[PDB]
Coordinates of C-alpha atoms and ligand atoms in Angstrom, one line a residue:
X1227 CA -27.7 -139.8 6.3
X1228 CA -26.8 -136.7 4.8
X1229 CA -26.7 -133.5 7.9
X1230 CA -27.9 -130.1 6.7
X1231 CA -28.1 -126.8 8.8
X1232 CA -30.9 -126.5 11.3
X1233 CA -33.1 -123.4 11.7
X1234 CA -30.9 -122.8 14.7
X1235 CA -27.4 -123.0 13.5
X1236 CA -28.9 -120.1 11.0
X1237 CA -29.9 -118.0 14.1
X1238 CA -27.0 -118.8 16.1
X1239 CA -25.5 -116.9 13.0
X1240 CA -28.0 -114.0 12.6
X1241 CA -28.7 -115.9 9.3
X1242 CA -32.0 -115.4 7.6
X1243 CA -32.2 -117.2 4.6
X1244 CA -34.5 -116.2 2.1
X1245 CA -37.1 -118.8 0.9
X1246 CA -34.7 -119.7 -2.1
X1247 CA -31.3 -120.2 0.1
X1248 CA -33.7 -122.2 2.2
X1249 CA -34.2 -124.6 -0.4
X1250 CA -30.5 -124.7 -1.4
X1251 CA -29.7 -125.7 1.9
X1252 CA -31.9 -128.4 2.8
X1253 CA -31.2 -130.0 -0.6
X1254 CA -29.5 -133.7 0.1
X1255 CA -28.2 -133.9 -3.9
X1256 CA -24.3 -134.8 -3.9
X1257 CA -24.7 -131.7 -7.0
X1258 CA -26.6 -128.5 -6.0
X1259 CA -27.1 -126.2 -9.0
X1260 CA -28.2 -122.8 -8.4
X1261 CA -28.7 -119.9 -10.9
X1262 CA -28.8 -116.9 -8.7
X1263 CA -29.4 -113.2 -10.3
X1264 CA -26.9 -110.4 -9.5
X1265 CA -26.9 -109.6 -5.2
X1266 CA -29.5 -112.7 -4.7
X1267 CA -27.0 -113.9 -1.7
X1268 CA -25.0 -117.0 -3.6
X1269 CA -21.9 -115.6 -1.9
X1270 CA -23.8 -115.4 1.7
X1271 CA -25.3 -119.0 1.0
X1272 CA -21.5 -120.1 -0.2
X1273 CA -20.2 -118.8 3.3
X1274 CA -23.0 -120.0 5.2
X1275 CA -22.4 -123.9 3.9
X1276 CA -18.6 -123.3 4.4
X1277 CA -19.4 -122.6 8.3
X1278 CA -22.2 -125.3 9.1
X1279 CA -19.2 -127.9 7.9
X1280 CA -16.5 -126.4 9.9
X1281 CA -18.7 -126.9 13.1
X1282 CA -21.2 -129.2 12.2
X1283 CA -19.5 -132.0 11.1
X1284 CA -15.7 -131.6 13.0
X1285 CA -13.2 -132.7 10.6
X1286 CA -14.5 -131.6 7.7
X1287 CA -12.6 -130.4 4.8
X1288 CA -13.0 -128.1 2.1
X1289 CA -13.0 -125.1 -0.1
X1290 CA -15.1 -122.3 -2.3
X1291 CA -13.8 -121.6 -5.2
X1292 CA -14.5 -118.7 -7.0
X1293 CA -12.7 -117.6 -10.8
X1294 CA -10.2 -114.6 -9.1
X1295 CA -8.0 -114.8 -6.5
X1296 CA -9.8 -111.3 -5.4
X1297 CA -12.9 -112.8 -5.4
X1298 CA -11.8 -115.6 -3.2
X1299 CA -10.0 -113.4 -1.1
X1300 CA -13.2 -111.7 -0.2
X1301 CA -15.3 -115.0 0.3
X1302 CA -12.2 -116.1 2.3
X1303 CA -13.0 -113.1 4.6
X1304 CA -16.5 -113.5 4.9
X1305 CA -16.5 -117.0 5.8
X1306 CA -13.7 -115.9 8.8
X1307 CA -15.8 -113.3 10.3
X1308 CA -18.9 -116.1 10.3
X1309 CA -16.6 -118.5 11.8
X1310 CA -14.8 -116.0 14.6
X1311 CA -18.6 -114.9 15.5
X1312 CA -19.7 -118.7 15.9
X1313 CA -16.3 -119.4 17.9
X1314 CA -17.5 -117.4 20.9
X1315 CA -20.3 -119.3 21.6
X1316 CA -18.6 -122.7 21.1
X1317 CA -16.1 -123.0 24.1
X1318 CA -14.8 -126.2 22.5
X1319 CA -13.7 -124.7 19.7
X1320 CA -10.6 -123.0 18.6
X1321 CA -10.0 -121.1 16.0
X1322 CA -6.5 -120.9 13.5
X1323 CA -6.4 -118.4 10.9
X1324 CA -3.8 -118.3 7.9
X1325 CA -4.7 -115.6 6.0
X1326 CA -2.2 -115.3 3.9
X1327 CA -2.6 -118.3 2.4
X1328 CA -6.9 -118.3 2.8
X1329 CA -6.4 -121.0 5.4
X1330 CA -8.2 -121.9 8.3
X1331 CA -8.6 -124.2 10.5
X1332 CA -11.2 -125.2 13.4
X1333 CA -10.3 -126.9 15.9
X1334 CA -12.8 -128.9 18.3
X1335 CA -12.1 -129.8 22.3
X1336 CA -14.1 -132.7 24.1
X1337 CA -14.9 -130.2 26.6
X1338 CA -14.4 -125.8 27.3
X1339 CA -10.6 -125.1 25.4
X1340 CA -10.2 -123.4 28.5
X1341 CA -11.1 -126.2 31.0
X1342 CA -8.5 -128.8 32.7
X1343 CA -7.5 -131.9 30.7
X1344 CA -8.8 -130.3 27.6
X1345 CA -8.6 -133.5 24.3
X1346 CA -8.4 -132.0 20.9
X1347 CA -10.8 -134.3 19.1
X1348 CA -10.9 -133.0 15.3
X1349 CA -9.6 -130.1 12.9
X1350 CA -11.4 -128.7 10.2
X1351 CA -10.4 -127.0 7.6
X1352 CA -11.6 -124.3 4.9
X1353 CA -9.3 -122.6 1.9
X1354 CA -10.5 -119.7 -0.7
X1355 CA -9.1 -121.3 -4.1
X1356 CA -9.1 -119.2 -7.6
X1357 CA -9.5 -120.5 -10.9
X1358 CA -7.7 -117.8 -12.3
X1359 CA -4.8 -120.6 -10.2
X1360 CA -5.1 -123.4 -11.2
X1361 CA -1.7 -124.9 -10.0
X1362 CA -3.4 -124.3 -6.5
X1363 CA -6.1 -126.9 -7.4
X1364 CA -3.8 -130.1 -7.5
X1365 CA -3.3 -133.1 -5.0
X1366 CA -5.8 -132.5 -2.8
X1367 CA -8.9 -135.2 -0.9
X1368 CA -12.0 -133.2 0.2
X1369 CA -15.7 -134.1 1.7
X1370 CA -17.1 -130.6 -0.2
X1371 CA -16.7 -127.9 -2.6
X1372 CA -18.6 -124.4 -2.9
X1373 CA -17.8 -122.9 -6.8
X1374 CA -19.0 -119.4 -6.2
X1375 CA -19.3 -117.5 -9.9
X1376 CA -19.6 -121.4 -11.4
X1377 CA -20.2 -120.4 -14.7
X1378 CA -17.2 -118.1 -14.9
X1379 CA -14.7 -121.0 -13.9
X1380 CA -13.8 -123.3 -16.7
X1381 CA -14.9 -126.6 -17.3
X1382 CA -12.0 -127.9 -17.3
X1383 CA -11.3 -126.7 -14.0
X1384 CA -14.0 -128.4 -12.5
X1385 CA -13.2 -132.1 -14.4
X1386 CA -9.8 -131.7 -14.3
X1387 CA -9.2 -130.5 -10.7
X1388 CA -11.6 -129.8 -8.6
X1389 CA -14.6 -132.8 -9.2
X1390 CA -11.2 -135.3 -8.4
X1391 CA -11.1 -134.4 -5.2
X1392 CA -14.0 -135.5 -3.7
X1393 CA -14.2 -139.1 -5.1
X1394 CA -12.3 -140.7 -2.3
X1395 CA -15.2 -139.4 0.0
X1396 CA -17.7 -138.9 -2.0
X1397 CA -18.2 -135.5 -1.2
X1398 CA -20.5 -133.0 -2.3
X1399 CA -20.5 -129.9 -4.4
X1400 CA -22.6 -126.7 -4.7
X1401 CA -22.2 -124.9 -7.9
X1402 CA -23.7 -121.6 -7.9
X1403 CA -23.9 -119.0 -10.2
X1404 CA -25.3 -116.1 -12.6
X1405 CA -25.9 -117.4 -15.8
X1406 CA -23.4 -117.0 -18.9
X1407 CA -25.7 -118.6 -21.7
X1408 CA -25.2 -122.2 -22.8
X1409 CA -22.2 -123.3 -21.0
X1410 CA -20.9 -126.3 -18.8
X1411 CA -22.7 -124.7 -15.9
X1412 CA -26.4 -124.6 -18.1
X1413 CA -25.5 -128.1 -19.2
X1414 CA -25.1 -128.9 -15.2
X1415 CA -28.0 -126.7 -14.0
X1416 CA -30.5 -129.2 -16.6
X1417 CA -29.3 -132.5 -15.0
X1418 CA -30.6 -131.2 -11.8
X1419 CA -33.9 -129.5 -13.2
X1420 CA -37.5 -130.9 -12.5
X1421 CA -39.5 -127.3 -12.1
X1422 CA -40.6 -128.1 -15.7
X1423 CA -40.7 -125.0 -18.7
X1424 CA -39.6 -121.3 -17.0
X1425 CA -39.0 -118.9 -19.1
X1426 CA -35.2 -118.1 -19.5
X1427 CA -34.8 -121.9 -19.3
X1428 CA -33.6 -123.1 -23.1
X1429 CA -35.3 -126.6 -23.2
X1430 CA -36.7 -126.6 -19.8
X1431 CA -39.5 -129.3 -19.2
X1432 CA -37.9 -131.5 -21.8
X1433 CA -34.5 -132.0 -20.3
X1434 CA -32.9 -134.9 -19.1
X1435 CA -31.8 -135.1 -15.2
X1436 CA -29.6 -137.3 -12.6
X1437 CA -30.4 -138.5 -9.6
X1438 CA -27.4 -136.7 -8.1
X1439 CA -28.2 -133.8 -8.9
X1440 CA -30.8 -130.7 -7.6
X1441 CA -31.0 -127.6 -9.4
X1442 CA -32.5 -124.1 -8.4
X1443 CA -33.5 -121.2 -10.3
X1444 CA -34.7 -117.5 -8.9
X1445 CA -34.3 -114.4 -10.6
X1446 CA -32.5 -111.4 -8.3
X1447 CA -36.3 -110.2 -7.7
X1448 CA -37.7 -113.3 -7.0
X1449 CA -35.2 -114.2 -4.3
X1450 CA -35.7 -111.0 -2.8
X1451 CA -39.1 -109.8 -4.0
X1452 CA -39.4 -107.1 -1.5
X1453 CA -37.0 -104.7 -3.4
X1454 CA -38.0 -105.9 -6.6
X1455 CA -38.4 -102.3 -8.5
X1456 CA -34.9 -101.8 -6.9
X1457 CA -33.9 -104.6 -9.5
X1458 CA -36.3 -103.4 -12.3
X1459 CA -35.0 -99.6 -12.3
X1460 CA -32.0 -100.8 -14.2
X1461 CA -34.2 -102.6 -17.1
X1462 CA -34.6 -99.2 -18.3
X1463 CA -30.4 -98.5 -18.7
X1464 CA -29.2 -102.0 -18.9
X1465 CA -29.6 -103.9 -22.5
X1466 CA -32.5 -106.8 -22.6
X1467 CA -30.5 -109.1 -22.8
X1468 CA -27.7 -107.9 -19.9
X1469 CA -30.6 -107.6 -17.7
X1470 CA -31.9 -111.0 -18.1
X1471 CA -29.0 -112.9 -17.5
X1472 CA -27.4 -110.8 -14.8
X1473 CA -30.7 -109.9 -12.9
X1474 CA -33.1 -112.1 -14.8
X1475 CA -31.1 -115.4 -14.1
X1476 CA -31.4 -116.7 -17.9
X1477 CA -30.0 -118.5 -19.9
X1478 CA -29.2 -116.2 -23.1
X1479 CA -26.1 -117.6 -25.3
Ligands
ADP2864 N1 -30.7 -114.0 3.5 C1 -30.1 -112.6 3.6 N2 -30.4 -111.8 4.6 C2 -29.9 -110.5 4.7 N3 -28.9 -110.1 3.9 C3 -28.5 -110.9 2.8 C4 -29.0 -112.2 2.7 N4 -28.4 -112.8 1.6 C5 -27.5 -111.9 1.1 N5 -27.5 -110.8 1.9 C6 -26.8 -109.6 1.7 O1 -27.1 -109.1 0.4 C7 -25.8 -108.6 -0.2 C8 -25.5 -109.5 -1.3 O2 -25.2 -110.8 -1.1 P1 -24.1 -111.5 -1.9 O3 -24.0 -112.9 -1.4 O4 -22.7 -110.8 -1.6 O5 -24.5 -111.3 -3.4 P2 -24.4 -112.2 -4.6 O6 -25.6 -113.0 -4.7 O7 -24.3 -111.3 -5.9 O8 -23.2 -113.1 -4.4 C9 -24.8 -108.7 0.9 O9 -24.7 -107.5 1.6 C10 -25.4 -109.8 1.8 O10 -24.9 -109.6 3.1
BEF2865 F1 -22.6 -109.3 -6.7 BE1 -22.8 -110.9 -6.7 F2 -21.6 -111.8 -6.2 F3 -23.1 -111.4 -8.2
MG2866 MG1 -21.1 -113.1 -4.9

């Protein structure tokens, strides 16, 4: 079996995943793909994964990595105050925070970590990594990985350091993203296609895909289609092209 978050570990959160991040969740693919527009929520559904492992599976280890270490500083923070909210109502929990090195660690009781004869029964553990450090990367054995800004991060990264570390486990990744045209992350997003042709999709409905992977694609207004003129406003003082790949979600070059 493969466990993904229920409708209420969201709650429990004050979560409300829009249809899209609904579908990115449930997903069971060993490679999730995900071209997101601009302020769609790929950093809130990064942080949100990162917490349903740290208390749903105890023992569980792993990192997002996103392609600054200012970036990952902020996920890294995000993902703390999600954990230290969920910590209050899970007595058997305990929480260790190393923020200076974008370390934590969760650590689960057989019973209340305030009760009498209290067993520590697992630790998990969660790290902001950079790509922008890529000595940080090295030596390490992991059951996930979150790439937040995917197709900023370079291949290599992923092949060379980060994809390594999850073959002793066979562990999972989410690689999520705004488009940059016709990279490593389009080539990724394909292998997990099956919506057939979408416009702003090079190829789409032709493409070959693995079983491994599940792709999703929404622009910024389509995730959130309540404040779509919001998003549309800056059509008119943003190039075409900009537009569509940082709101639009497509593929351009
Ligand atoms: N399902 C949601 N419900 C309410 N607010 C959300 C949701 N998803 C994202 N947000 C909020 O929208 C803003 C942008 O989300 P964020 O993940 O940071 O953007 P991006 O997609 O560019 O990474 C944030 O303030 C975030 O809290
Ligand atoms: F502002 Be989002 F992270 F693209
Ligand atoms: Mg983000």
């Amino acid at each position: 079996k493969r466990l993904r978050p229920s409708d209420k570990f969201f709650e429990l959160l004050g979560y409300k995943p829009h249809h899209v991040q609904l579908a990115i969740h449930r997903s069971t693919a060993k490679r999730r793909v995900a071209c997101l527009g601009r302020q769609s929520g790929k950093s809130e559904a990064a942080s949100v994964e990162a917490v349903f492992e740290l208390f749903a599976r105890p023992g569980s280890q792993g990192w997002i990595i996103a392609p600054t270490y200012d970036q990952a500083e902020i996920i890294f923070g995000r993902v703390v105050e999600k954990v230290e909210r969920l910590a209050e109502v899970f007595p058997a929990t305990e929480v260790q925070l190393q923020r200076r090195r974008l370390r934590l660690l969760v650590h689960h009781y057989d019973r209340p970590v305030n009760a009498p004869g209290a067993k520590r029964v697992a630790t998990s553990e969660f790290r902001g990594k950079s790509a922008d450090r890529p000595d940080n990367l090295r030596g390490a054995t992991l059951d996930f990985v979150i790439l937040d800004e995917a197709a900023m991060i370079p291949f290599s990264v992923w092949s060379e350091a980060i994809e390594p570390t999850l073959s002793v486990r066979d562990g999972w990744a989410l690689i999520i993203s705004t488009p940059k045209g016709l990279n490593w992350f389009y080539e990724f997003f394909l292998m997990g296609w099956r919506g057939g042709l979408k416009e702003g999709i090079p190829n789409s409905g032709i493409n070959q895909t693995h079983p491994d992977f599940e792709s999703f694609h929404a622009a910024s207004w389509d995730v959130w289609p309540e404040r779509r003129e919001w998003y549309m406003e800056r059509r008119l003082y943003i190039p075409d092209l900009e537009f569509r790949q940082e709101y639009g979600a497509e593929f351009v070059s």
